[PDB]
Design a protein around this ligand. Structure first.
Ligand SMILES: Nc1nc2c(ncn2[C@@H]2O[C@H](COP(=O)(O)OP(=O)(O)OP(=O)(O)O)[C@@H](O)[C@H]2O)c(=O)[nH]1
Ligand SMILES: *C(=O)[C@@H](N)Cc1ccccc1
Lengths: 205, 85, 61, 82, 392
RNA sequence: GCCCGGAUAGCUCAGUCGGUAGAGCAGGGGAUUGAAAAUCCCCGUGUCCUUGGUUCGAUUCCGAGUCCGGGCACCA
RNA sequence: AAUUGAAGAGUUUGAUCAUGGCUCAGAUUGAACGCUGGCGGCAGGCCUAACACAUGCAAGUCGAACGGUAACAGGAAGAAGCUUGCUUCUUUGCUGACGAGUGGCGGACGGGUGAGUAAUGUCUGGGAAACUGCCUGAUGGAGGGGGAUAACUACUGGAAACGGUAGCUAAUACCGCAUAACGUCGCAAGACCAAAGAGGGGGACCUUCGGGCCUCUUGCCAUCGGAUGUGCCCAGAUGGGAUUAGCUAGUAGGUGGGGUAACGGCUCACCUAGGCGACGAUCCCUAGCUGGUCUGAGAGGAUGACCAGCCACACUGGAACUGAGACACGGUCCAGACUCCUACGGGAGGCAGCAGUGGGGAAUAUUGCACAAUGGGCGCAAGCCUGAUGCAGCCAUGCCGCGUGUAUGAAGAAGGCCUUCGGGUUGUAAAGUACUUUCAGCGGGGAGGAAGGGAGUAAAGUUAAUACCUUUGCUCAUUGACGUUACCCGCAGAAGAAGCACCGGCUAACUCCGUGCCAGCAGCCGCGGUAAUACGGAGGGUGCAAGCGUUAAUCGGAAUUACUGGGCGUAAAGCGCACGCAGGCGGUUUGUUAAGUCAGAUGUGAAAUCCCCGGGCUCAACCUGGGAACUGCAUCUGAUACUGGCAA
């Protein structure tokens, strides 16, 4: 289900960074970005209508790593929600536990965060959840199991947490390895560089 | 067939000999009453009618007739005796 | 009538095969391809691309 | 014979009984007259687990409804005192 | 199915070898009737053995009929084999089940090459003991030449490294004993008596990885296709998942039936003459020549080395020494596979009577083992009798 | 397992009661042409399915085996 | 909170704009095939041959109905060993219980298949000429006698199947007599009609020493009910074809008899001469119907597998009996075909019930475990039967979740590939190193689905009764197929787990080498003729993922069947013209009826599924509560503008 291959080559095809290898290094730089998406990376792409909205759709999927079958499922759920379908989609895609624990700083990157998820290292509301597909509800608290606590990996990931923007719809402790979800994400509180407008239009054909 | 519910087979044979025999005797009394009506003598028909009356009543109560048919035989037969006289 | 797919085959008057649909637009009347990979119609030899068609298995080496 | 029996519904290994009034000569999940409520033996300490329209049960027993002892046990477990 | 097999007597698997019209079928029938007086459980006749239309079309045995009878000290399962050159196929199937064969030798003629051919494969299949039956002695009353014909039987085993002088000489009339001539029926009792003193108990290693050859293929209605044979090594129970190796790909199936002589059995073991029912397999998918085995054990090979002893024309083999390229049929327990001979350097003319070796590569993939004794035939006659030297 | 028929150069058949294998339909190689029809110039490419035997010598004599097709069975 | 929802591109031509078919991009399925393939949860899994079938099992149960008990275990009398009660053991229905038989009840439910059927069916909504075991409510009765048979003995036909002759005995089996009513017939007088006892316990009394008697549970008969089920009738709706135009004679209707639980040509006798039909009868072909599923913006089109209601059938066809109910899957009789046994005279049998097999087919599963749970049958009950069901095995068939690891890693290697031979690229990719361990594997703990039932005991009731019995609590030992479970903990170790199609435009993604209108590719435009982004390979890249493609099938795009929502002078398309019936539509004024219409109310529109807000399985799939919806139909009471009817 995971890409589990060249985790940084994905950012090369889209020309921008996707935080797959933020890590303990400030700026990557040894990735050869923007000059070569591949072997013929110097060639200018035609960029047709269908393709440009496809690259917009595929960019967000490389962010969370979710595949199409589950992403199509997320679309219909966002479709059956009242209000703005396009704005609903980013609320759900930020609701995944691995993404939430990523916002807490317990996970270096989303890929590193998913490891904590499946290895039952995360416990929310006294309930350990292994499914990364857990859509977090408002007003709850997340944490780490004592045996899976401070085992040399989550500590350094906490150091990476001070170099991030730290979202405002949730809160972390970082003193006793704890975190709490206050409210659902607002469209004005996210990265703002990612577009979801064309993604709605691709699934409408 | 090889099923111990084959009893209902030989029981129904034993039941039909009984039932058929009793229903044929009930019908011959109905034939008996008509002959008097075909004769014209109301008194003979009167006598025939009053003796078959306690017969059909006893058969419907035994579950042989559905009680409405029993009533009709006593009914239309009396419809004959008034038209006769 | 039926079309014979792939490069080289071995059918001779018999050898039970399988028939699937598909017009080819070159041979009038022909509307069926022969399912290469099934029954006594062996797959083609040495085809690494699109081996789902022409019944070539994944290399045993 | 009109009875107030149950009806197995739900998933495999995860049972859910639906108390219902039906004809005794019909299937378990077949035709009936009307449901009365439900039974959740695999429930928890949430807040629910059983809802029996005790009035509707009584409206049929007057007509001649024969309650099955599993359901009658639930009537005794929905206790008329509390 | 009914009647589970009771293990009250030491079970032995025997059979008969001989010649066409020597009375093997007649004797097997006569054997059961004589045993019928001490235990009425067989009482088999001639037609009980020959059950095929062609067998009653020419009065000969072409198929292996199975029969069993038990003495108050042991239990025996006899096999009636066909006695023809073109019927040597079913003959070896019956020979593979023998812990000990019996020679039906008519004292009227004696040692015919076809009779020698029966012992030749017997030595090559692994028959340790053979009790001889001097049959048809009812028409040959010249006791002088009775001993003369007995002497030639003694020497034929002798030149083929077998104790012919130690072998129990049993006279008898298979025909008169079948009708009831007590004198000849006593011969059958002498046959049964010597049967309990010349046959030891063979060791069956059931602790070894399960192996089971294919003897015959059946298709019981309402049950599917069942296959029979004798378990070489290992054990099997109902519901045991196994696999089969044949001349083509390995197929999987689970055991759903363990029977012996149309009678039930819970667990199958090595040496017993039992059968296993495959799970949902067609008659077209399974044919004579394959072999059952334990899951993930044997991969079919295609080459091996083998020594051999070639017969002569006056022995049953050839009279003309051949060259490279000659391809006779390599016979081993259930096959008639033809293969090309890759002879070693130094010999160009394999003269009839050689004890030379060769490297064999077959046209069909099959499961084999080191030290397997087999024989080679060609054109309707046996040409070789070798041993698997080494697998490659 | 048994009993027969096809197994003959790309394809279809003839040739035998031993003597160094044919024909037809083919198809193909060159000159002309952008490339071909056509025209002119030349044509066999064969394990007689495989293997052995009675051999001065086997397509044909005897069979075994494998492949395909067609009949009987047998029924733990 | 309860439908916030509609995309287009390629091809006619030298080029263009229309018209117009053709084709693809999407989703889906009871899927098949090719390749590959780790686990798990929930569902589905013979679409063709309604083709033929071995074997096991699928409906039995009641002694609290009876005569009996052939067996099993006791009691009791006795008998032999011999440790004089330690054993052996012939009888005895006297008990616990119980084969075979009589009788009661069930077997018409449950389960399967979809052949037939185009309306005798189904669906929507009504209606009256009905019936209704078991359950439940009301009022009474429940008195007294007789005659047979099976089982069982004797004998005996037949191989078997399967009986026969002569006798024995009981009952909740059968048949009377008595008594009858708001019950039946009739206007009424009157006439007539029912039945069955067993089970437990016990004081006085009574004891032909069977027992009566008292009392409690249950049962029996009648009548009116109720509920539920079932039968019947009407209206509307429910396929294609008009190259099918007349069809029907018990047919259209009336009268009388018979018959049906009930109405009727349902069936007969007489008379009348009619009935249906274009808003489509008969005939031909196809098909189970609906709730629903899929698709679609909706309207619609297609479809009817699983789940649920209804109808039809049981090897083919036909008939009838029993019974409340069948005019009957594991019932009966006959005929026919197909298998089988045979002692050749004569008989056995129906898997479209769970499995299973041959065979058909592109293709669809184990001759498994249990009655622990739910439901059903009988029984007072304990329990017994239970292939319904609960579970398991097999299959990637579908849907969802999870895994094949995370971080670090520049000499920016090797090798492969391309190259302006500079180098680029594969590429943080790998190795090395530091951590982690889900699920598999192995080893221990360990939920819940379980409600009850049985024995003991206390109390309140019924009663002469502290008894029996019933109800409400308590106590002990417990009932678990799945099951080496769900789940939790521990240990070893990156360890055991990534393929599939594609890359000319359509439509996201490329070069080289090799083959040269050869081989092959292909959905369309079409490619290939010696410099191929389209053939094959190689490297790279793209999409998707334990699945990826292919084919078949459906709707969509297709406004190319246009009701929403198309056109007809030249593109396909005005009949040659006109008259005119049915039909359709119709100026204007007043009144009126209130049908259509519209408002509101009522009953109904089954449940589940679809939509909304919540809850529980780690989440989801899935299950589930309430609500909404079910866009339709019938009735009632009103409104009178508009359409229609009547009248001036
Ligand atoms: N007089 C006599 N005749 C015998 C005797 N034994 C056998 N026979 C006859 O020989 C004939 C042999 O027939 P089979 O019994 O089939 O011979 P076989 O040895 O089995 O030969 P295959 O059938 O080829 O295996 C029988 O028909 C008998 O009549 C015997 O001892 N005495
Ligand atoms: C099956 O019964 C085997 N045990 C013996 C057998 C009998 C007949 C044919 C083949 C095998």
């Amino acid at each position: 289900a995971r890409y589990l291959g060249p985790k940084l080559k994905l950012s090369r095809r889209e020309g921008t960074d996707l935080f797959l290898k933020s890590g303990v290094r400030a700026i990557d730089t040894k990735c050869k970005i923007e000059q070569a998406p591949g072997q013929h990376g110097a060639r200018k792409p035609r960029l047709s209508d269908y393709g440009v909205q496809l690259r917009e759709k595929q960019k967000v999927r490389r962010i969370y790593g979710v595949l199409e079958r589950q992403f199509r499922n997320y679309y219909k759920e966002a479709a059956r929600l009242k209000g703005n379908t396009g704005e609903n989609l980013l609320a759900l895609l930020e609701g995944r536990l691995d993404n939430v624990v990523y916002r807490m700083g317990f996970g270096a990157t989303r890929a590193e965060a998913r490891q904590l998820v499946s290895h039952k290292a995360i416990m929310v509301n006294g309930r350990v959840v292994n499914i990364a597909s857990y859509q977090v509800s408002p007003n709850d608290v997340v944490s780490i199991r004592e045996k899976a606590k401070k085992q040399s990996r989550v500590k350094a990931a906490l150091e990476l947490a001070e170099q991030r923007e730290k979202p405002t719809w949730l809160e972390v402790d970082a003193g006793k390895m704890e975190g709490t979800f206050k409210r659902k994400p607002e469209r004005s509180d996210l990265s703002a560089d990612i577009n979801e407008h064309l993604i709605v239009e691709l699934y409408s054909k | 067939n090889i099923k111990s519910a084959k009893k209902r087979a030989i029981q129904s044979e034993k039941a039909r000999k009984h039932n058929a025999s009793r229903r044929s005797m009930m019908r011959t009394f109905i034939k008996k009453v008509y002959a008097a009506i075909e004769a014209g003598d109301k008194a003979a028909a009167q006598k025939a009618f009053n003796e078959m009356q306690p017969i059909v009543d006893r058969q419907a109560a035994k579950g042989l007739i559905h009680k409405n048919k029993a009533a009709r035989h006593k009914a239309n037969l009396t419809a004959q005796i008034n038209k006769l006289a | 009538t039926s079309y014979i797919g792939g490069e080289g085959h071995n059918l001779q008057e018999h050898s039970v095969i399988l028939i699937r649909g598909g017009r080819v637009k070159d041979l009038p009347g022909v509307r069926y391809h022969t399912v290469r990979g099934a029954l006594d119609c062996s797959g083609v030899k040495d085809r690494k691309q699109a081996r789902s068609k022409y019944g070539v298995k994944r290399p045993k080496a | 014979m009109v009875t107030i029996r149950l009806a197995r519904h739900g998933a495999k290994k995860r049972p859910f009984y639906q108390v219902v009034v039906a004809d005794s000569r019909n299937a378990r999940n077949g035709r009936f007259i009307e449901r009365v409520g439900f039974f959740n033996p695999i429930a928890s300490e949430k807040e629910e687990g059983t809802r029996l329209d005790l009035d509707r049960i009584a409206h049929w027993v007057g007509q001649g409804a024969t309650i099955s002892d599993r359901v009658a046990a639930l009537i005794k477990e929905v206790n008329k005192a509390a | 199915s009914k009647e589970k097999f009771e293990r009250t007597k030491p079970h032995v698997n025997v059979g008969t070898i001989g010649h066409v019209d020597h009375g093997k079928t007649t004797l097997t029938a006569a054997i059961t009737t004589v045993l019928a007086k001490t235990y009425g459980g067989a009482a088999r006749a001639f037609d009980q053995i020959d059950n095929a239309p062609e067998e009653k079309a020419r009065g000969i045995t072409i198929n292996t009929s199975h029969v069993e009878y038990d003495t108050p000290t042991r239990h025996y399962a006899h096999v009636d084999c066909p006695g023809h050159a073109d019927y040597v196929k079913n003959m070896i199937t019956g020979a593979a089940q023998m812990d000990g064969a019996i020679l039906v030798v008519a004292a009227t003629d004696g040692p015919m090459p076809q009779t020698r051919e029966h012992i030749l494969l017997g030595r090559q299949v692994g028959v340790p003991y053979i009790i001889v039956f001097l049959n048809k002695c009812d028409m040959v009353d010249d006791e002088e030449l009775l001993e003369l014909v007995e002497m030639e039987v003694r020497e034929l085993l002798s030149q083929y490294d077998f104790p012919g002088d130690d072998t129990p000489i049993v006279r008898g009339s298979a025909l008169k004993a079948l009708e009831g001539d007590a004198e000849w029926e006593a011969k059958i009792l002498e046959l049964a008596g010597f049967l309990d003193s010349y046959i030891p108990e063979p060791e069956r290693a059931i602790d070894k990885p399960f192996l089971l050859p294919i003897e015959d293929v059946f298709s019981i209605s309402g049950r599917g296709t069942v296959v029979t044979g004798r378990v070489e090594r290992g054990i099997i129970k109902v519901g045991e998942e196994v696999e089969i190796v044949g001349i083509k790909e390995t197929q999987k199936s689970t055991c759903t039936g363990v029977e012996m002589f149309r009678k039930l059995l819970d667990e199958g073991r090595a040496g017993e003459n039992v059968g296993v029912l495959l799970r949902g397999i067609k008659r077209e998918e399974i044919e004579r020549g394959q072999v059952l085995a334990k899951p993930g054990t044997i991969k079919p090979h295609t080459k091996f080395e083998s020594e051999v002893y070639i017969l002569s024309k006056d022995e049953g083999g050839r009279h003309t020494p051949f060259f490279k390229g000659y391809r006779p049929q390599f016979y081993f327990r259930t096959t008639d596979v033809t293969g090309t001979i890759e002879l070693p350097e130094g010999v160009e003319m394999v003269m009839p009577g050689d004890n030379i070796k060769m490297v064999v590569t077959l046209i069909h993939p099959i499961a084999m083992d080191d030290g397997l004794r087999f024989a080679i035939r060609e054109g309707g006659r046996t040409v070789g009798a070798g041993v698997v030297a080494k697998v490659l």
